[PDB]
């Protein structure tokens, strides 16, 4: 029997390997539910300092 | 540094055992990882347990 | 004043503990697993927080 093991490690650094998912455009100043490289959340985005 | 599509791995019947332990395979198409390790070998069937 | 503040402080801190689950953030558990085990983990989390 041929055996292969995949042992990815997940979400602690700049991610590199993922996603047949198309990125949409960026909006601002609205309560929106967002996703950044698997970091999922909800809130309003703003320009930072 | 690539774009992996795990669905084709799931949607093929060639594999007798396809078992994940910290994720659900239906979700693997929406996550981002740092890097992955593929460990390959061949053994006797009675030991896969 | 001191005492009150201090107490409140630690409350917030207890939001960053595992209590035995895989992660301390509900969003990861929900977006990573399927429900029949997400239940088993969310159970531990809510027990600790209560």
Swiss-Prot record, chain B:
Start and end residues of each stretch annotated as Integrin-binding motif: 44-46
Impact when changing residue 16 to F: In strain: Omicron/BA.1, Omicron/BA.2, Omicron/BA.2.12.1, Omicron/BA.2.75, Omicron/BA.4, Omicron/BA.5, Omicron/BQ.1.1, Omicron/XBB.1.5, Omicron/EG.5.1
Top-level taxonomic group: Viruses
Substitution effect: residue 14 to P: In strain: Omicron/BA.1, Omicron/BA.2, Omicron/BA.2.12.1, Omicron/BA.2.75, Omicron/BA.4, Omicron/BA.5, Omicron/BQ.1.1, Omicron/XBB.1.5, Omicron/EG.5.1
Effect noted on mutating residue 12 to F: In strain: Omicron/BA.2, Omicron/BA.2.12.1, Omicron/BA.2.75, Omicron/BA.4, Omicron/BA.5, Omicron/BQ.1.1, Omicron/XBB.1.5, Omicron/EG.5.1
Function comment: Attaches the virion to the cell membrane by interacting with host receptor, initiating the infection. The major receptor is host ACE2. When S2/S2' has been cleaved, binding to the receptor triggers direct fusion at the cell membrane. When S2/S2' has not been cleaved, binding to the receptor results in internalization of the virus by endocytosis using host TFRC and GRM2 and leading to fusion of the virion membrane with the host endosomal membrane. Alternatively, may use NRP1/NRP2 and integrin as entry receptors.
UniProt subunit comment: Binds to host ACE2. RBD also interacts with the N-linked glycan on 'Asn-90' of ACE2. Cleavage of S generates a polybasic C-terminal sequence on S1 that binds to host Neuropilin-1 (NRP1) and Neuropilin-2 (NRP2) receptors. Interacts with host integrin alpha-5/beta-1 (ITGA5:ITGB1) and with ACE2 in complex with integrin alpha-5/beta-1 (ITGA5:ITGB1). May interact via cytoplasmic c-terminus with M protein. May interact (via N-terminus) with host bilirubin and biliverdin, thereby preventing antibody binding to the SARS-CoV-2 spike NTD via an allosteric mechanism.
Record's protein name: Spike protein S1
Taxonomic classification: Viruses, Riboviria, Orthornavirae, Pisuviricota, Pisoniviricetes
Gene name per UniProt: S
